[PDB]
């Protein structure tokens, strides 16, 4: 059985003392990723950079509205920095197609190369 409910998951995380860990542990337990991230119409011929002013998905990505892929925005809670600043809100986020089932998890787990603007491990081809 069990019917599933996005709001159940978001409620659980929103009211957790550590929402990021709550979501991470929930996924690790086999939980269904947060759905309904807002997928954009785009050419799929963009730069493939992680977080952009307009959609920039390449052939191997999807572009989504940034806030819809942000755990803190989606939970309607303050962001984890003194300023309360969200890097995603008002922007567009590119998610590799293999991970597009869980954009919120993807943005939580991953980091952007400050040099090339691509996701580390998913686009950055800078020398190591
Ligand atoms: Zn946010
Ligand atoms: Zn890079």
TrEMBL record:
Domain ExoN/MTase coactivator stretches: 6-128
Signal peptide, first to last residue: none
Cellular compartments annotated: Host Golgi apparatus; Host cytoplasm, Host perinuclear region; Host endoplasmic reticulum; Host endosome
Subunit annotation: Interacts with host PHB and PHB2.
Purpose of the protein: Forms a hexadecamer with nsp7 (8 subunits of each) that may participate in viral replication by acting as a primase. Alternatively, may synthesize substantially longer products than oligonucleotide primers.
Family: Belongs to the coronaviruses polyprotein 1ab family.
Protein name: Orf1a polyprotein
Source organism: SARS coronavirus Sino3-11
